[PDB]
């Protein structure tokens, strides 16, 4: 191709969206945004194929541009806006709040949450670096840059971000015994406690995770998201609690 692609065909779309193969020929291509294309759920899919409030497209469009939908507390009007893991979708008119969290099957689940929990989110610290004028900042998994962070925050840690102000309220270090969520692979959606982090210089780091049932599984570090300490998650968990 001579430039960026703009079309996504249904068979080539992510499997977890659960799009009918005979409904059409194309699938909603997620626009550029906070999350990866393959790891994002466009708002059209959420409103139509999951919540069933909309039957089809321009009704999703109309819902959006009445400004009823808020992603992380901000109004969005793009049908293919790439909402992703741990995004808060608020519908004031119906009085609903949702957090995008995969189920054990590995697909985004419709998980209703309270307003108090909807007031915040968690971000995995992808990067920590000094900016211009000697200003430290942290880049999270959703592309949020937060300046002036706590010094104790390092990469692979998890920062609790307040949506209204976009500031860090608390943080969780990456250590053994922490409660952890799998965000990719075949173990995608499972929840466990850290046991060991195997380190390979110049290679991908591997982490061992033990579930509440004492079953153990190993996963790459890029697929790891701390959510709390064992027995005290900082967010409400879907049904099944990431078991099996």
């Amino acid at each position: 191709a001579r430039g960026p692609k703009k079309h996504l065909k249904r068979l080539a779309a992510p499997h977890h969206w659960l799009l009918d193969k005979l409904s059409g020929c194309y699938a909603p291509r997620p626009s550029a945004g906070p999350h990866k294309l393959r790891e994002s759920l466009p708002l059209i899919v959420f409103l139509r194929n999951r919540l069933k409030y909309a039957l089809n497209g321009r009704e999703v469009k109309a819902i959006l541009m009445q400004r009823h939908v808020k992603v992380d507390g901000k109004v969005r009007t793009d049908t293919t806006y790439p909402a992703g893991f741990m995004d808060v979708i608020t519908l004031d008119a119906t009085n609903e709040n949702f957090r995008l969290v995969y189920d054990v099957k590995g697909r985004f689940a419709v998980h209703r949450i309270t307003d108090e929990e909807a007031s915040y989110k968690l971000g995995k610290v992808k990067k920590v670096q000094l900016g211009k004028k000697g200003v430290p900042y942290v880049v999270t998994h959703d592309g949020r840059t937060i300046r002036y962070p706590d010094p104790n925050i390092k990469v692979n840690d998890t920062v609790k971000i307040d949506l209204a102000s976009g500031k860090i309220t608390d943080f969780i270090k990456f250590d053994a015994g922490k409660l952890v969520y799998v965000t990719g692979g075949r173990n995608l959606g499972r929840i466990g406690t850290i046991v060991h982090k195997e380190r390979h210089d110049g290679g991908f780091d591997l982490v061992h995770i033990k579930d509440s049932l004492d079953n153990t599984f190993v996963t790459r570090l890029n697929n790891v998201f701390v959510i709390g300490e064992q027995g005290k998650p900082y967010i409400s968990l879907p049904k099944g609690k990431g078991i099996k």
Binding site: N97, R112, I113, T114, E116, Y234, I235, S236, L237
Partner: peptide, 19 residues
């Protein structure tokens, strides 16, 4: 934190017969 309590369906089936 606990998940939001489930809300019962607001609307229910309504029935009518004629002719």
């Amino acid at each position: 934190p606990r998940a939001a309590k489930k809300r019962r369906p607001a609307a229910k089936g309504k029935n009518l017969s004629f002719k």
